[PDB]
Amino acid sequence: DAPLRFGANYTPSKNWMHSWLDFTPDDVRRDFATLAELGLDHVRVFPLWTVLQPNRTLIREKAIDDVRAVVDIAGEFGMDASIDVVQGHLSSFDFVPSWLYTWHDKNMFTDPRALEGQIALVDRLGRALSEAPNFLGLTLGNETNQFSAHTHPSPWPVTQDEAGGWISALLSAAEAAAPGLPHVHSEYDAVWYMDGHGFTPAHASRLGAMTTIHSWIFNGTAQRYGGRSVASDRHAEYLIELSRAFATDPDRVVWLQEVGAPSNCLTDDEMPGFLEATVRWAVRTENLWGITWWCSHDVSRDLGDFPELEYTLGLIGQDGAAKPIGRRLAELIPELRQRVAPPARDTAIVVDVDEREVPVSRAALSPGGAVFQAWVDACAAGLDPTLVTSHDALDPVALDARGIRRLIRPDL
Amino acid sequence: PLRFGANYTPSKNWMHSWLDFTPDDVRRDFATLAELGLDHVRVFPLWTVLQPNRTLIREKAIDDVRAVVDIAGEFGMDASIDVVQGHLSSFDFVPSWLYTWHDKNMFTDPRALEGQIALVDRLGRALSEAPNFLGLTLGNETNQFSAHTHPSPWPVTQDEAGGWISALLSAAEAAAPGLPHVHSEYDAVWYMDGHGFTPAHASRLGAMTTIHSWIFNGTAQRYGGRSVASDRHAEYLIELSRAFATDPDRVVWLQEVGAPSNCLTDDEMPGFLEATVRWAVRTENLWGITWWCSHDVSRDLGDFPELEYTLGLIGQDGAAKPIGRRLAELIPELRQRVAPPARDTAIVVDVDEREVPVSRAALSPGGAVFQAWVDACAAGLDPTLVTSHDALDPVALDARGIRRLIRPDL
């Protein structure tokens, strides 16, 4: 199997995503040179929906050309590039074109006109990027399910059918525009942790070409267990194995598409050790595609209203130099690049599911929950657990397929 | 000397052209307008381009606005700029830092106010150096964000609306001294009961009263596209604004007026322009008329209300349309300022102790005061309006030569 991939979610050092408004190739080059110096082999890139498609029937060739230029500039440094189509959500900010706003408000997931416009955007963008030999594939959009969550201040709600329907429509457009590439979709961890959410673990584990994972210890994990702890260090691995439970493809590949070291969870001195612990833990999982760190560069303090933790997630500082977490990752990449046989994991923690294969209690999976604690306790007891649904837990065919020998049924 | 201009709507990709600013496209549009004899344009940068983060006011975005002003000058024209769009032609452009997780009332939130003050300051300082820069309008119909009919209103009391207006105007005055800076409401300010922006705000704050006159507000529907009520609607709002002015030399700017296709057939569009222009210039201390709009909106841009597409003086083919030809014929006849007619008969607007109309609905199309205006015009009068306070003041009436009061019922 292929070597493990290591990359960074690209957050432009100069003016962040707003730099798309005055696209400057040499700024991208300077940013990418620092990333290439760490040994990174790919970047994840975020165009803005407000720039790509400011009117439903105006998909701007000039904006798509700028995205292709970023892909080409990554190639100059021998890096590949994946592109998220619909932003959509980034770092607490929502970029929504005016044709889905106020007088034009429409549910981006279920409105036929919004769906037709996103299909057309995926087609135009995918077709332009498919020419590039270093273009990896499309992600539908960053954490786009956050628009549907009941915690969102103005949600666009979806049923489970509706969420899968949006995912499949856009994936079908991506396959038509850029065939043969591994197009995916991306939820934040409400997909695993939020009861009643329309996007389901099955969606994440079964739809798209690989399972994507966003692992963020500011989700209550560090607050309950400590920044440097079993629970925090192995959180990404927890979501990976939890996703495995809901996969129907035995060869399903997992992409740790976002993981970072936030300053409200870790002191500055703890951050290199956390990166190393997280990276080493996730590499010891089966069929991992690679790890994409959040993020490439610190956010400029010239920009206001970001949550405080967003500013210092970079591998590279605003002074242009690699930060301690960047240097640590650069040391680990050659050590961990070549793939090795993964651990056995014969002990599974069962996740009770309902008829629709949705967990009975996603809260139990969330930090502090009965299933989450069972994972923490098993890890702290030196085991390497995995997880199974209560359906599979009674199927000795499915159990023997994964070599599962001991079950752990958490209390409630 | 009366001024005639157009609200600039770029032919190529409309306001979205700011995302790939192209001077030579502005030049082609503006040559078309100068050929009509127009002497000024009104220009709309986008809030999302100018200020995508609260503390990133983009020098390049502002340089492009200055470039549009300079290109106007290449064709002998002046330019006025609206600072905060904000609202344009059914679409709202709001930066992500006032949206969802960052939603804040743009009129009352201290950081949003500070961000707008700063934006007004930076645009004013950059434009003040151009000899053909007329001044700033705070924003196009920005009061619509506070209306109870808005899908997601940012409500304001009367005091809060006045405070937002005055705060941004003070910023404009400091950044571009000696120029007239104004604010702009759509006609809820005149017609909508309970609305936070008041007639007093429009007629007293800022250097000139601005008027947005749109006969699709119920006027043409009730009375007909070509009618007494529709032809003289801009004139009605002008004289209604006069009733609420406390400055006897208050000047009025018909900043927006157009001929919408849902109210007027194509054949009656030139006649409507002529009737409205001729009506409005017969008012006292009119600064000028700025037509909506310069250019038809491209049909490759979707989801506009249908009437928006054909409001231009110039077609998408780059040629003058019949309404554009008619305006060009009228301009040389009406540039020379003439003394306006006497208006010795005034219709009374009952006002409360805060000088807000008791019933702004009565002022709206079909309302009792609106009807009284239409009737008095049909009677061969040139009416004006007066508050019930001034109607009981002989000195206020004499200062305006008002001899007879008309009091409508209910």
UniProtKB/TrEMBL annotation, chain B:
InterPro entries linked to this entry: GH
SUPFAM superfamilies, sorted: (Trans)glycosidases
Protein name: Glycosyl hydrolase
Species of origin: Microbacterium oxydans
